[PDB]
């Protein structure tokens with residue numbers, strides 16, 4: 549049968565959090581299949597709070 | 601214009617492609633910022649909507665034709681522009697390439713817009729290449745209106 553797959557990518561607010569949680573500055577996420585291909589890079593910025 | 605950018609010059613962003621009355625000029629709802637005293641420091645600007653209406657905001661990003669102009673105007677090589685709000689987020693990077701002239705110009709400017717809901721805030725951050733907003737619009741909605749295409753004259757009817 550067809551299978552539905554879901555995932556996510558995290559974008560932190562400051563570089564200190566990025567370094568504290570992932571110990572890297574230039575991270576990437578790659579997801580590929582037979583007819584699907586994509587690459588993601590996080591973006592660090594200060595944003596208005598939504599749910600805090 | 602005269603109180604928002606203490607650092608950066610606001611009086612030199614004119615071009616011959618937008619000339620008016622034989623002199624170089626620019627758009628009247630947008631502002632072209634440039635280096636002051638040989639520096640282009642980072643900027644940060646926020647606006648909170650308190651007009652109880654939707655606000656239409658417009659900005660732009662500049663793409664020069666060679667690295668010499670980029671270095672001479674912004675004193676940087678890897679610039680970025682970030683625009684965020686409660687439900688909007690985007691990042692822009694300039695691209696340097698040689699292009700056919702259109703109105704005598706080999707560079708480009710890309711134009712972007714968004715709608716801001718009442719009580720919301722919008723933040724701009726930039727390393728360079730930013731054409732900042734100057735004027736915005738608070739919109740009122742209605743019924744029975746549209747845009748038509750015609751060459752008929754106006755009458756007293």
Ligand SMILES: *[C@@H]1O[C@H](CO)[C@@H](O)[C@H](O)[C@H]1NC(C)=O
Nearest residue numbers: 604605606607641642643644
């Ligand atoms: C402009 O430069 C001054 C340095 O005297 C600095 O204090 C100020 O914060 C700068 N402007 C902005 C909007 O940060």
Ligand SMILES: *[C@@H]1O[C@H](CO)[C@@H](O)[C@H](O)[C@H]1NC(C)=O
Nearest residue numbers: 563640641642643680726727
């Ligand atoms: C301007 O932005 C850069 C990029 O993060 C930063 O390293 C620099 O410290 C900023 N300027 C000042 C005066 O802090």
Ligand SMILES: *[C@@H]1O[C@H](CO)[C@@H](O)[C@H](O)[C@H]1NC(C)=O
Nearest residue numbers: 748749750751752753754755
């Ligand atoms: C207006 O446009 C129509 C078709 O677009 C044309 O037939 C007509 O001649 C035009 N009128 C004038 C006054 O130019």
